[PDB]
Amino acid sequence: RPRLWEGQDVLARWTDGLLYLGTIKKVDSAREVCLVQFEDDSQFLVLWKDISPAALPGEE
Amino acid sequence: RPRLWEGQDVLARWTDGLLYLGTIKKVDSAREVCLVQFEDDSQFLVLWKDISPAALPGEE
Amino acid sequence: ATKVARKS
Amino acid sequence: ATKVARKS
């Protein structure tokens, strides 16, 4: 059973180093990327390693 | 300087046990709660201990 | 870790 | 630990 799936809410690491909340729209297992839709309805391909369905609160 | 402040984006733990992304609207250091506004524009009082400006992505 | 969610 | 953010 895959870690990531269509319709799942996830955090995704952006190019600015910050985590944004979005929703998976497509999962590509060959390239290990997902199309993620963000709160502003933008959509980008993000590597699986930079997507997480869960987070541990913590300090910098 | 305080850990939490107005206008800050944070994860907040909700009564369903899940983390939702919101923005701090008010800080109350006497009661150690913040008023947090969520993406549906709802606003609720949440204890400081359940608010985090930062997270470590991971697996449940 | 705790699952994240959006408002429904 | 990494800061979270909303779209601006």
Numbering used by the authors:
A (entry chain AA), B (entry chain AC): 28 to 87
C (entry chain B), D (entry chain A): 21 to 28
Study text:
The three human PCL proteins all contain a single Tudor domain followed by two plant homeodomain (PHD) fingers and an extended homologous (EH) domain. The Tudor domain-containing PCL proteins are essential components of the PRC2 complex that maintains gene repression, and the Tudor domains of PHF1/19 have been identified as readers of H3K36me3 in vitro. In this study, we provide structural insights that the Tudor domains of PHF1/19 are also able to recognize testis-specific histone variant H3tK27me3 via a conserved aromatic cage, a salt-bridge, and a hydrophobic surface, and both H3tK27me3 and H3K36me3 engage the same binding surface of PHF1/19 but are bound in opposite orientations. In the complex structures, PHF1 and PHF19, adopt a classic Tudor domain fold with a five-stranded antiparallel β-barrel.
To elucidate the molecular basis for the recognition of H3tK27me3 by PHF1 and PHF19, we determined the crystal structures of PHF1-Tudor and PHF19-Tudor in complex with H3tK27me3, respectively. Taking the PHF1-H3tK27me3 complex as an example, A25 is stabilized by hydrophobic interactions with Leu45 and Tyr47. The amino group of A25 also forms a hydrogen bond with the Leu46 carbonyl oxygen, and the A25 carbonyl oxygen participates in a network of solvent-mediated hydrogen bonds with Leu48 and Glu66. The trimethylated K27 residue inserts into the aromatic cage, where the positively charged trimethyl ammonium group is surrounded by the aromatic sides of Trp41, Tyr47, Phe65, and Phe71. Asp67 and Ser69 also contribute to the K27me3 recognition by providing some polar interactions. Mutating Trp41, Tyr47, Phe65, or Glu66 of PHF1 to alanine disrupted or significantly decreased its binding to the H3tK27me3 peptide, whereas mutation of the more peripheral F71 displayed threefold weaker binding. In the PHF1-H3tK27me3 complex, V24 is coordinated by a hydrophobic leucyl patch comprising Leu38, Leu45, Leu46, and Leu48, and Leu38 and Leu45 form an L-L clasp interacting with H3t-V24. Compared to A24 in H3, the side chain of H3tV24 enables more extensive interactions with the PHF1 leucyl patch. The single point mutants L38A, L45A, or L46A of PHF1 exhibited ~two to threefold reduced binding affinities to H3tK27me3, and mutation of the more peripheral L48 also displayed slightly weaker binding. Compared to our complex structures, we found that both H3tK27me3 and H3K36me3 peptides reside within the same binding grooves of PHF1 and PHF19, but their backbones are reversed.
